[PDB]
């Protein structure tokens, strides 16, 4: 029903990449006919819709795409911005069709980091989005991001799952440890919205997931116990800040 | 010293012409492209583009001015457009031998034995 | 910092209606001055704003008004409007906040019905808004019931544990089980979607409830295991419907 | 019989009824006619409301839209589409037994009193 | 009934030092047995009870300490941590009766920056701590900052009259601008609450402690006239600074 | 940062029964400890200062303390503070002074006692 | 197909609390502004409104306003002329310096050199 | 005499805004107090009163409110309105007394189309207003239209000349076309009136702006010879319309 070229595409991307090499699928794409911008648009938005790919195997796609790139060096800008498209397509229109397709998109912009395609500025720019946008500063719910809709924070263990243990040197080291802060805030908001009862506790699952990916990144530090202690975290990153010039 | 701009949530039935005639005149820019929308998300197709202004001091009026412009559809709905850095700065800085030559391969060919009929 | 009168009426209805004062501090209430439009619309008020008195003291006050219409005719229409305009409201702006307010508000229009203060039509008008308002056909999600939002639920289990008892003879009967039946199926509608996994499964609190409130209202209940089977019972009801009227 | 109060919710708070009557002149022949300021209590969110009792029921049809939408304005401007449909309670005072009373007495009551006494001394 | 020595020292710091024998009670307290424990820490708390002095004398203190630390070189930080302890205690405390010691307190901090005593980091901490210590973030009162409780402000400005005319020249002056930003942003959640009406306005002579002390830092600033105002230069500064962060 | 104090103590811990609370002790060159001054009467605290060599164990040290519940004689519960010290500057080695410990043999102080021997 | 009406040739001394009486019962409509005369032109003065209707099928009974005869207090008339507005846009919806002009040093310099 | 922030606004419109100076009159622009109505009214009059601007400096203005909108998006809607309003109610009022206030107002509207602050639409709405508003269709002198009133050619010549180049591309090139046809008709009524003698012939000065207009739009037509041929081209004009 599609196309011959178009299902070869996606037999290479969403099938043949997690058997077989990605030498052996990288030089049958550099095949394809570039100078079609037919075909190029096409298996830019394959790669884009990485929902397709197993989730384990994301990480070849990364690869595949960082080595294309040395000969069709536009299709790598039109995939990432893509895929940092979508990741903002995601969160606004929130709907939970999209929660695999979201995950996967977070998890493939990580994956681009560590075959660097994109730097952290990058990834702790999207990071921060997650816990912003959309987000009332006072800590009220809204829109974008109601009561009990927590999917903020699988995206942030997403992405810190897959590239966050690299942020532990130099620069990018005090960058996490100063955006994990602001994000146990974010937590703690949550956490303090009346929806959460004692017979309807805040969900286990939610909780081991931070404390799993807090674990990893940094051993010895805590979540904090209270709100206070987290509105007194940032509240003394910030102050520090502005008494440094 | 960010010069990269995206113009996202338009109209998905908008082309690059009457885009580029709207924002008539395009400040001088070495990068210019055109996106459409994705499908897969069927309720919310929204096409953009990119521009990578040359002097970074000219899209204060530029942002200024269709950050919120309206655009209108076929049936007339509106699609208020948004202006912001793009999230990646990066923008298209011999040629390769093998473009062009996947309908001469054996992998090619092997594969059209399975997938007609 | 408050007028004698008003932080008075404040005591009477939150402080001291106990469950043996109610006549008590009825005869407090007849003296007030009800020829003065300022005072009276207080007390109203006073009573809408349910959630300022102990839950299990909810139905003291539907009792006092029973007895307080034989005197004052229109009060008794003021305050059920009232209530049922913020159960409303509640539901278009429907802030965490805001959730015991609205769970008292439900309690109260049940005990309401069982002092015969308002009909069964007002109840189950009430119950289908629960479960109607704010709510696609399609049963996916809106702005007004988002996905993980399930206090349509509480609201309906508060109010069928209220009065639903009283739904068992006669008429009485089947327009509580033909709600069910759609009730079951907006239940469905929510179990269904994509955010509840095996990892972060549906509330068993809520199920719990669920069961619970079915349970005690219909013990041979018929609870359906899926969301088809519940799309069933509403599709043959609706042969029922047009039977009854004329089409079918 | 057939439904025959009207509520229209959602108006602006700073709204009186003298300017509803004037916004709504003239409205058909109803035996009820009463508005409600806003609560407070909750305080972002204050509307104020009126309803009607239509002799003839269906007069309902032309009000209805003539007004359900029909947008307010306060005095800084922000819109108020109003909403009009049937009052989920279709009773209304009917005129009638006889005057309580007691009715405006409390003043000359021993436990008021007292509790004046102890009310006068607060803060 | 006081020992000999201890009065001795009482009478060094609070009676006789006054303004210009300074050189002369130095002296005096060098010949103490600082390498007795129990003396030494008499002195030190002494120094830090400095609401014994008056007001237009506390500078004489800081310029006594200031010397004697080119003997003992560990008094100075003893007295600085105390003082800044009393600071702090006086806020989780808060009562009144205690009032002028804690305005004496603040005074003396400020003067201790003027010889050379404390950094510019120590002062600017103390400042925020007036505005955000027990404070809610929403504006809101709360158990250490009711709504009738303006002494934060009267201890911001007992400080920014001891020192802020420092604050004019490179960093430093950056420094003041940015908590000036905060600074007004919670005089302005004073105002908006709902204690204060017609019949019982904000006292107006606290509005005129406020515009003074500004007037006299930065007679060029623009004061917010709106809470709305106040919020939003808040942002407008909170945005520029996530840029250099990450 | 590497200054850490402790705070809202029990007004009669001496030192030593703090530093034997507080062991295991990591590197430290500089701990200071103040008692209560009797004048503040109804509001009495000790606390300390503790310097930290590398400056991480104090995300250790202060899980480890922060919070930690002392108690009086009487048997009166004490909720610790433990934070960075608001001044972040301590002492260091060095000549001394040679008045140190000669005001007893001081014409002024002499005066002074006769006007104080007849209280 | 349009919605903006013009009601022109109008009585200078006419406010907009008036006109929305002669006007009861208005048709909805999102946009509603009264401009006074320009004083510019003393022999001609005439105050006007703008009217952007929601419904766009009753400005033809709306219409049928045009030629209504305004007095003002001192009696004459003033048949208002209603058409459709030759412009048919309107604004519907901060900048960071309005009302920065006082604290101005341009302004400042101007302000000595007209006070003076 | 005046208020010392309206003298300022005065200063910044009718003398310091020159080709060159209009971005240091924006900003200075941004800072009034748009908020009090006063204010903001007085400054939109100011700006409909374009006849106090230098002729050639007048394009500044239009400008001016092209960048003035990006931040009070409302003000440029009423400028608009005010500038039509007065070209209309020029025509009510017809005293030589306002010509070149008219002829300022007129170059006004153009100026507004160029910086793209009014569509095509506006612009030939009013090209047709100068030929038929208080027109009688016979083509006889009328109250509003006496005959040796010429000013509608002064008001078309000085709108089309000003952005009529602009109109020659796509679909506002056969909208011009058009009204060209009905212009040279009542160019033809004017010259055809009775009060035009050999001693007192039709102005020269007119007829000159008309075909140095027309050359600089379309060079490919010269003005009809004879008042039946401008009827002949109207009549096929609308029943060529008819019959497509
Ligand atoms: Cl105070």
Same mark, same amino acid.
């Given at each position: 029903k599609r196309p011959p070229l178009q299902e070869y595409v996606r037999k290479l991307l969403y099938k043949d990449l997690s058997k077989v090499t990605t030498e052996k699928?990288?030089? #049958?794409?550099?095949? @394809?006919?570039? #100078?079609? #911008?037919?075909? *190029?648009?096409? %298996? /830019?938005?394959?790669? /884009?819709?990485?929902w397709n790919v197993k989730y384990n195997s994301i990480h070849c796609v990364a690869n595949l795409l960082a080595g294309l790139v040395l000969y069709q060096e536009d299709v790598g800008i039109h995939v990432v911005d893509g895929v940092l498209e979508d990741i903002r397509l995601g969160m606004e229109v929130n709907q939970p069709k999209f929660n695999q397709r979201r995950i996967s998109s977070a998890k493939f912009l990580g994956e681009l980091y560590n075959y660097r395609m994109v730097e952290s500025a990058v990834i702790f720019r999207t990071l921060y989005s997650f816990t912003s946008f959309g987000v009332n500063p006072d800590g009220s719910p809204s829109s974008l991001d109601? &009561?009990?809709?927590?999917?903020?924070?699988?995206? %942030?263990?997403?992405?810190?799952?897959?590239?966050?243990?690299?942020?532990?040197?130099?620069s990018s080291k005090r960058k996490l440890d100063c955006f994990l802060v602001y994000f146990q805030r974010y937590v703690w908001w949550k956490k303090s919205l009346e929806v959460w009862t004692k017979?309807?506790?805040?969900? /286990?699952?939610?909780?081991?997931?931070?404390?799993?990916?807090?674990?990893? @990144?940094?051993? *010895? /530090?805590?979540?904090?116990?209270?709100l206070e202690e987290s509105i007194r975290q940032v509240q003394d990153l910030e102050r520090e800040f502005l008494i440094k010039l | 010293a960010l010069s990269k701009v995206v113009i996202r949530r338009? &109209? !998905?039935?908008?082309?690059?012409?009457?885009?580029?005639? #709207? $924002?008539? !005149? $395009? !400040?001088?820019?070495?990068?210019?492209?055109?996106?459409?929308?994705?499908? =897969? $998300?069927? !309720?919310? @197709?929204? =096409?953009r583009a990119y521009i990578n202004f040359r002097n970074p001091d000219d899209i204060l009026l530029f942002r200024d001015r269709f950050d919120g412009y309206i655009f209108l559809d076929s049936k007339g709905l509106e699609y208020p457009a948004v202006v912001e850095f793009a999230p990646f700065q990066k923008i298209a800085k011999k040629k390769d031998a093998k473009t062009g030559s996947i309908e001469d391969d054996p992998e090619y060919k092997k594969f059209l034995e399975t997938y007609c009929v």
């Open positions: 699928v990288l030089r #049958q794409m550099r095949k @394809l006919p570039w #100078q079609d #911008q037919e075909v *190029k648009d096409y %298996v /830019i938005c394959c790669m /884009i819709n990485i109601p &009561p009990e809709h927590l999917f903020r924070i699988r995206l %942030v263990c997403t992405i810190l799952d897959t590239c966050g243990q690299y942020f532990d040197r130099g017979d309807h506790p805040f969900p /286990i699952d939610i909780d081991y997931m931070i404390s799993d990916t807090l674990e990893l @990144l940094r051993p *010895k /530090i805590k979540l904090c116990n209270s | 338009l &109209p !998905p039935g908008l082309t690059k012409e009457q885009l580029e005639e #709207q $924002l008539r !005149p $395009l !400040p001088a820019h070495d990068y210019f492209e055109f996106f459409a929308a994705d499908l =897969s $998300l069927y !309720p919310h @197709l929204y =096409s």
